UniProtKB/Swiss-Prot annotation, chain B:
The lineage of its organism: Viruses, Duplodnaviria, Heunggongvirae, Uroviricota, Caudoviricetes. Belongs to the phi29likevirus major capsid protein family. It comes from Bacillus phage phi29. This is Major capsid protein. Assembles to form a prolate capsid shell of about 54 nm in length and 45 nm in width, with a T=3, Q=5 symmetry. Homohexamer. Homopentamer. The prolate capsid is composed of pentamers and hexamers of the capsid protein. The gene is 8. It comes from the Viruses. It is found in: Virion.
């Protein structure tokens, strides 16, 4: 019951094609002039939203019936489901473990006289993942209320299936969004390593420059000697060329074909150098392309269970599709952000012993890794918070825990950017525990 | 002929070179031209 419906509901008319035809002379509508019943075709021929009971053309008291019902059916998939790593049925934590390279010590035979049993610890960094996503897709079918919209069982049984298929399309869309959220999360954290570019689709020269920064970075990533420059934990990480995925957008694909790859005599010298996927676009401001390993994405399922129930008091069913999965990102893989706009100068400060457990009165050495986007060297300010009086730290990065320390510490490697009115300081951080000693007391120590 | 692009440059440059083969009010400038595109510098 809707009582006042025009055919043009929602419509903004451009030029009234009915009046535009009959008021034509040589206005290119003259081919629509010999159409006999065009003004009826121009009325409802763009689809009608709200139905209205149209009386029959011969006998007025009869109505015009629906003679065909088409139930359109879609299948939405995930491009990114090849980046998943499988399922984890039991347990909720994933433990990545990574030993890193050493630092070469000089041959010194006189120093080595006392240091044979030195016990230099290895450089292991750990990263823990967890089940994040835990949610369900609710739908309700009122199986007997929907029997009034149908006069055929073949369509009613097909419309019930379409409501079912909608639950599975809300899966593979939100799975696609939660993985794209992992890129926009990781960039808002500043954990991506930024390569500054210029925006393409403004000129060819902005695009050709971009392809030169594509193929250079993907070769810098897969150099055999590795690099520290492209991770979030700053470890030596070689990657391989077959493992490299490029998650650009649908704008750089067709522009590269037309402006560049069409006029290429040797297409393999101007194409992107890794695997290429195509998306709708990253919702972060300034982000265009992302170059990552497949080892970056860590998507482990945990549950996929469609459960039903029927309400007897009101005749509906309810269908619950529970999706539980682990949606996180490795900080050991090469992850390159191709960022167009302005960037901060330093995006991240990586202090190298992130987890330290030095003793009461001992020493921990700290090495910071400033992630600068420019050749300006930045001076690093060390500090230490959460502690007591005698805890101090050297401007080289050497902690000196007091003899009277019991608190869980935290050290900081501050790097500022802006001026004193807008101080703009990015800062790294490592957590130090104390674990009290023995053999102490008194005074003059 | 040392073309100097300044920066803040987005226009397709046609670098000309005319040779005066002629005279006053009959210059008959013979020109050959090179079309110069612009790669930005971030």
């Amino acid at each position: 019951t809707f009582n006042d419906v025009k055919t043009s509901l929602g419509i903004t008319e451009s030029y009234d094609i009915v009046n535009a035809i009959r008021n034509s002379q040589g206005d290119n509508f003259k081919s629509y002039v010999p159409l006999a019943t065009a003004n009826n075709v121009a009325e409802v021929g763009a689809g009608i939203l709200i139905n209205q009971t149209v009386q029959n053309d011969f006998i007025t008291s009869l109505v015009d019936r629906i003679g065909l019902v088409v139930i359109r059916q879609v299948s939405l998939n995930n491009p990114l489901k090849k980046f998943k790593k499988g399922q984890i049925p039991l347990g909720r934590t994933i433990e990545e473990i990574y030993t890193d390279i050493t630092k070469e010590k000089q041959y010194d035979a006189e120093e080595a006289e006392q240091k044979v049993f030195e016990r230099e610890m290895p450089n292991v960094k750990t990263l823990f993942h967890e089940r994040n996503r835990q949610g369900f897709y609710h739908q309700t079918i009122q199986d007997d209320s929907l029997k009034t919209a149908f006069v055929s069982w073949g369509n009613f049984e097909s419309f019930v299936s379409s409501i079912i298929n909608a639950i599975y399309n809300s899966a593979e869309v939100d799975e696609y969004e939660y993985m794209k959220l992992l890129v926009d999360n990781y960039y808002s954290k500043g954990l991506f390593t930024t390569v500054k570019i210029d925006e393409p689709t403004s000129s060819t020269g902005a695009l050709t420059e971009f392809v030169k920064k594509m193929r250079a970075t993907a070769r810098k990533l897969t150099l055999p000697q590795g690099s520290r420059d492209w991770n979030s934990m700053a470890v030596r990480t070689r990657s391989y060329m077959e493992d490299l995925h490029l998650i650009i957008d649908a704008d750089l694909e067709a522009e590269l074909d037309v402006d560049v790859l069409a006029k290429a005599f040797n297409m393999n010298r101007t194409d992107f150098l890794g695997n290429v996927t195509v998306i709708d676009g990253f919702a972060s401001t300034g982000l265009e392309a992302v170059l990552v390993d497949k080892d970056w994405f860590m998507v482990y399922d945990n549950l996929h269970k469609m459960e039903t129930v029927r309400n007897p008091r009101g005749l509906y069913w309810n269908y619950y599709y529970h999706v539980w999965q682990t949606l996180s990102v490795s900080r050991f893989a090469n992850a390159v952000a191709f960022v167009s706009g302005d960037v901060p100068a330093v995006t991240q400060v990586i202090v190298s012993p992130n987890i330290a457990a030095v003793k009461q009165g001992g020493q921990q050495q700290f090495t910071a890794y400033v992630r600068a986007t420019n050749a300006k060297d930045h001076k690093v300010v060390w500090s230490v918070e959460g502690g007591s009086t005698g805890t101090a730290i050297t401007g080289d990065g050497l902690l000196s825990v007091s003899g009277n320390e019991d608190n869980q510490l935290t050290v900081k490697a501050t790097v500022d950017i802006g001026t004193e009115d807008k101080p703009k300081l990015v800062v790294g951080e490592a957590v130090v525990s104390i674990r009290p000693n023995n053999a102490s007391g008194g005074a003059q120590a």
